[model samples]
Target chain A: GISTPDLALITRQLATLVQSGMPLEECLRAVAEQSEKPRIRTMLVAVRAKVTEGYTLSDSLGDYPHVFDELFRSMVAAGEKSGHLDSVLERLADYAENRQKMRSKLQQASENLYFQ
Target chain B: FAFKRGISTPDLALITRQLATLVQSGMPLEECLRAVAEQSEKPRIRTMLVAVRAKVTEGYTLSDSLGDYPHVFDELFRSMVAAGEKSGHLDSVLERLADYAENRQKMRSKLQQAS
Candidate 1:
């Protein structure tokens, strides 16, 4: 079922696809394809249904606030409000990259820093 | 994440569809949310809509306020609302969202039959 996956990496991939003007449904499918487990699979399926039904992606990610934090959801919410999902995702990708880098360096300095 | 499912719930997407239709008909968003919530056949969905309306009344963005329920509202859909919200075109977005949701349900129903 639900397990650990690199959210930052997944977010980055999703941002790239959306920026390229991929359909949101297709984008989610692509993201879900990276993993072959059941947990995220269920979420993706449910999310796809919700999105199709009219809920926003922020709400779609609401399926697991534990997976998609409030901060993440909130930023996404603002992104949705601004209608800049691509830009928002691009920035999120960048942010995740920065955080990953920063955390990587910090951990390297401490010999155990971990990231998003 | 384990169920050979077949309609355990009354498709929560209907809330969006109904809300959009109501709002487009000139109903206030707050009232529309409440009305949809009241008509929900499932307690979970009804409660979620009520919570959504409460947040609207308390001055939360419709996109952010839906945080309490994730299975019903996802990031992609959330962003859709945000896009509409940003441009002051929420009505049209909801209309599209509603249509999308309706189409998806129909497709899923057909898929189930085929399988």
Candidate 2:
């Protein structure tokens, strides 16, 4: 039994790990070990194990269909084959950050409207 | 080396420039295709040559074989290849394909950058 964790926190950690030049496998392991939420931690472990076994990082993440959808996997595969894995990951992180920022802005606006 | 990815526009530009150079050299069609395909670091382009060569060996024209990869080669590409096949000027057509591919990449990059 675990509480829901903040997606923002997880994304921030992911960005940091990627920026540090850590191998994708090691990054996944770090995320999994640090996650307090059972579900996220389990998924991260599974993804790491698959990557460790030589399965494509994208394909392994794809197994968690809900978390990694078709677009994500396709872009990742393209990036891997094209030898731009790090850049693609950074772009993905930027996309996630933008989405989170927009969500926060909208939430704040709604709260302000309600308070007024 | 693996084909450098992400900078699609740059790759397309490089391919176009190379194609133009090869064509201006007055190289033969088969030799040019073999040379360009060999020179390309892009895995997809290299993989495409296998199919192209097989089709040529099977008596299918190069244009028809290239048509199989519409994502990489379109109707325009097919037409150009066909024209080159008929004119015995595939080197020139390949040069055109390079130009087209380069322009397409530029357009794509612009759109993505705008978004």
Candidate 3:
């Protein structure tokens, strides 16, 4: 149950790890260990378990539907398939940031209107 | 966002091999897609392949149909299909894709073994 900002940062970190040519299981575990949030770390641990068990990143991410949306999963799947997980993760990071900005702007507008 | 998992490389390699064989037999692309979709056990792959077939049936090029699911079919895969369509050598292109996938798996296995 991470927020958009958390996910955006996480994706960026994942991109770096993956691009470095580390095994995906190690990447997941490393990212999980680096996270400050207990819940996010737990979720990552679970995801790593799935990867260690031979589930594709997108497939493992599928179990956390509440966290990863369709766009996220699809991009990850494409990344995994194309052998370009790092690049896709980079794009996904931007997409996540964009989503968060949209929500922030909308919230600001709503607050302004209400105060006016 | 689908309930099932995405297609693994091994599974994709199998589909590519089967598709190449089917196309070599001179079957229509739509028919080939439908045949593969029907044969797939995973609902995820089956449903997506069926959707791709539907797109082909609607007069979309095989590349365009594959483009509909970028997540399932990446740029490399789509570009190869597009080249196949243009060169009128789809079967050969599919064969190349299968070979590439198989080689990728082999390389990965080799790396794992060395580690």
Candidate 4:
């Protein structure tokens, strides 16, 4: 169950790893290894395998639409296409964070409204 | 012990939230497990939790006890527990897991609606 928070944490970690000048496949491996979730690690390994076979990160992620939503893939696609994936990943992480905050605020607002 | 039927994300999230709150309140870890296990309505979930509690009472670490149920706890859950045990920050780690679980449950509902 790789949820939004999982994606956000992964994206944040990936941004830092990519920014460190690590190779993409190696970065993926490192990230995968760091995850305690078996499914998440397996998913990352599959993505790394795809990258090894010369697929773009966006396309690799597209293989798992259930795990990576359209917005996530689109952001990565733009990042790769613009040759600034690190910045794009950073932005994506922020986007996930903002979305989470919006969700929390909405929940709080609804609760307060209902109580009134 | 595996469940013949799996637990839902929302149920799992509720359990995580309860566990986080209990641990954060400075209750004994074993006591927290006992409380959660007693509160669960799902027999399968309750059984696994009771087992974990027993293991903890026998001096097994929480992560170690949870490891026995890979299908239930998963890697993320166990790993966070492992980290918390080492870092002495289980309360925060549990809270993070609760947040993750809740977000996942929300996303699942959204996906169900879209489909």
Candidate 5:
């Protein structure tokens, strides 16, 4: 049974926290505490634990490769090296927003095409 | 240069050209520094030139004086300048600096377009 909550919503929220200057560990803790889904909460807790152990944020999240893919990890690594973590997180948020907008526009365009 | 440190690309291009011209004129290094400092419209740049000139007068190498401003000169610029000083090819070095700055600007524009 599909629910109102989705992976996209979780990812969007995670991106928001990161962009808002929350330290990586704190962001994970906050997300885990707020999550209604037990699976997401557990996953976030594990991610936070890894972050607390002095692992790079990308590597900590990389432990759960299913949740954080190669593209995400690569961007994180770049951000770390360049000391632009906040800006990179903001860029990622913009990327996600643009992707969503494109999908919506494509859906609308498809409907218009069908009618025409 | 400017993109990395929030300086405008056009300003960097202009400055780079002016630096190249001075280096190529075969002027004494101190005279070149004073001439460029007098010609620059930007106070920050002029101030930097005067300071660098003073350092050079105090026996610091040209590259060493410029190396203090990493945000402006960058690692590549400083390294090449040092090489130029050692090789006694400061004019050629400035020419290379201009080329490097232009290449960096082009790369930045491409990255901006991608983003």
Candidate 6:
């Protein structure tokens, strides 16, 4: 909720990409292209490559604890487990957006207090 | 916010990439710094970014602000950023930083894998 607001957003984004008939590699390739940061890009790119080369998205994601926390990894782990990754992402989107909104509100308040 | 462990190339890459994105999108420097500071997940990284944000709020240029974190921002990184700021392309400079970070990470990973 504090530093990890977009877990839901990215989850939803990936779900959308997958639902649109994109394979794991193709889905992550799109995600990589959409990413604004090269760090995320390289990660997704590497993950995408790994998926093509025989590894799970969650597997590849689990390697980077500094970025993808346990919750993120576990969410994908569960979804991939139950073959409900899309549903999982949708739920995470609704849930994560709430956290993001809360964070956004708090940030504005902090920004006002800190910068004001 | 405080740590004896140093920053990694991949970690620095993400920070610079975010910095570049915010700057290129025309967000105010202070706001960008503040946003970056808040979003940073790591305590040490967050601490350094917050410091930089405070400095920019105090009217220091980004390059000068970066200099304060000499351990993280090496000479080549600082000099390139300075040149970009002077050329009125700090965003592009930061973009390059992200690329540089990505490359370093790849090399490091390869080294780790080879070992």
Writing each residue's lDDT as its tens digit, candidate 5 over B11-47 gives 4644564466445544467766776676556788888
Question: Model 3: per-residue lDDT, tens digit, A73-100?
Answer: 9999998999888779867855775675
All candidates: TM-score:
0.45, 0.44, 0.46, 0.49, 0.44, 0.51
The most accurate candidate by TM-score is 6
| Candidate achieving higher TM-score, 1 or 6 | 6
Give the higher-TM-score candidate: 5 or 6. Answer: 6
Q: Which is superior by TM-score, 2 or 5?
A: 2
Give, for candidate 3 chain B, the lowest lDDT window spanning 10 residues.
Answer: B106-115
TM-score of chain B of each: 0.85, 0.66, 0.87, 0.92, 0.79, 0.89
State how far residue A13 of model 6 sits from its true place (Å).
12
lDDT (Cα, 0-100) at A101 in candidate 1: 44
- Could you tell which candidate, 5 or 6, scores higher by lDDT? 6
Q: What is the model-wide C-alpha lDDT for candidate 1?
A: 0.66
TM-score of chain A of each: 0.78, 0.81, 0.83, 0.83, 0.71, 0.81
Clashing pairs in 4: none
Kindly list the per-residue Cα lDDT of model 2 for residues B1-115, writing each as its tens digit.
4443233554545444444444444443344456556555688766666666667667778789777666655677689879987998776676667667755754554444312
Better of 1 and 6 by lDDT: 6
| Candidate number with greatest lDDT | 4
Candidate 5 residues lying further than 4 Å off, grouped into runs, are A1-116, B1-6, B110-115
- Candidate 1, position B68, lDDT: 53
Instruction: Mark the 10 consecutive residues where model 3 chain A has the least summed lDDT.
Output: A12-21
lDDT of 3 by residue, B3-87 (tens): 4334676567556755664555455788878767765657888888899999999999989998878877789899999999999
- Residues A64-100, candidate 2: write the lDDT tens digits: 7666668767877898899777667656655664565
Query: Candidate 3: lDDT of B45?
Result: 81
Candidates 2 and 3, the one with greater TM-score: 3
Candidate 6 lDDT over residue span A1-116, tens digit each: 21444454355446544544446676677656656666677777888888889887688887787766788778878988899876676566556655654655565556556654
Better of 1 and 5 by TM-score: 1
Q: What is the lDDT for A43 in model 2?
A: 83
